[PDB]
Amino acid sequence: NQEVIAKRYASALFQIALEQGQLDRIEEDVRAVRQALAENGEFLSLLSYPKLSLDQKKALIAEAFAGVSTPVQNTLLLLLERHRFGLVPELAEQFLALVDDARGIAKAVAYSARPLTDEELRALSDVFAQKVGKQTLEIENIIDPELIGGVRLRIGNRIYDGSVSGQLERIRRQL
């Protein structure tokens, strides 16, 4: 039940970033907050400690999260005073999923037997950008020695599988 709440928080910050005109700064700040909280897991356990006063926890957030923009810091302090600071990485994931749709870029995970060339991935992105609807498309390539002699792609929640689907389709059609 945390993704639906982080979607609301990230949509509020997203509308602020649209109406302000500083979307790149807010996106860089959200990526910095996500990387800093992924690199350090004890900060949530520190701010969940109840003997620390709320003014002291606001002092820790205002000291640590400095250099980021004003609405990102206001969002972090608002999540602190609403006791919803545990969902800040979920907020970062939802906000980056909002701004990727804002830019028009989509993320995809590719599996192939051999690592493909740099032109073939751009060709696959130029093919699949018309099918998905985005202007720019991203391919993540994994080595994956299980599949043989083909490429399969999971973009969004749709899998375009044609690598080992021939052999499985054959042994399902014969038997």
Binding site: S112, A113, R114, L116, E120, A123, L124, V127, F128, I148, G149, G150, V151, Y160, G162, V164, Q167, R170, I171, Q174, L175
Partner: protein, 51 residues
């Protein structure tokens, strides 16, 4: 008895068929796929593009 023959026949068939799959994959690995991987891929995009 007639059902028994028809079920054994399908089962055995499935065992031969299973063997045939395992090898199908092994033999396809065995072939040299520099040419094939570029060819397949280029075809696959084209093939995806059409459907």
């Amino acid at each position: 008895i007639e059902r028994e023959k028809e079920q054994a026949m399908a089962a055995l068939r499935e065992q031969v068929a299973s063997l045939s799959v395992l090898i199908a994959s092994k033999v396809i690995e065995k072939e040299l796929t520099e040419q094939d991987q570029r060819k397949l891929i280029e075809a696959y995009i084209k093939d995806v593009q059409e459907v």
